[PDB]
Each structure stands twice: as C-alpha cells, then as structure tokens.
DNA sequence: GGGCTACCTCTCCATGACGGCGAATACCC
DNA sequence: GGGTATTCGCCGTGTACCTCTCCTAGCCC
RNA sequence: CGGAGAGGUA
C-alpha cells in the first residue's frame, strides 16, 4: 500500500485542508437530548 | 436548555499528588 | 438537605531524588 | 571579546497481573 | 466499559 512516512511543518492551508469546520463554541452535548 | 456536561465530568484523578506529571 | 444551574479564572496550597547532560549566562583578564 | 565555569532546566527511573474504592460545586431555596 | 489511587502476587 505505503511505502515511508513523512513528517513536516504544519501550514494554516495544510490545516484548512484537513478540517471539516470551524468550532465556535465550547458546549459539546446536551443531556437533556443526548444528541449534540 | 444546556445542562452542558462538561459541568458532569468526573475528576477521576481525584487521588494524585499534583506534584506528579504526565497525567 | 437538595434539586436546579451551571467557571464566562481565585490564592496559598506545596515542602523527603539523583545523575547526567547540555544550554544560557558569569566571569576573568 | 574569548575561553572557561556555574547555575539552571529537562529527562529518566523493570515487566506482566489480581482484588477493592472512588469519582460535582454552589446556593437559594 | 473511563482513569486514577491503595493493597497484594511473581
């Protein structure tokens, strides 16, 4: 499948192409509704 | 309505030394 | 006592390891 | 300033397992 | 099925 692992620096557009999406707020879920 | 969890989350090192580390 | 709502950062807790190694100053001309 | 000491800061310190206990504060009701 | 602590085993 692969061959060597490569380690680098972490660029702001390199983490934009690994994120699915801005968090904004620091809640997490509910408990009165377990859905988040 | 928030009963937010993070006000639930068990201290669960509640016996630790807090001069200890790595955890 | 206890059920509902939530920290959306305040002070002295501490105090009995030792070796080693390397970096960041201290100093002596 | 150049080489040498001295303090200061980090890293580390044996494996596998078996029981048990213990997990939230504040407050205005 | 989450991690700490205490005791114990070799």
């Known amino acids: 499948e692969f061959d060597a692992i490569k380690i680098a620096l972490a660029s702001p557009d390199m983490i934009r192409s690994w994120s699915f999406g801005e968090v904004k707020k620091p809640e997490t879920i509910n408990y009165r509704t377990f859905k988040p | ?23």
């Open chain 2, 1 to 23: 309505k928030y009963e937010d969890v993070m006000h639930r989350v068990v201290n669960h090192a509640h016996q630790r030394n807090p001069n200890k580390k790595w955890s």
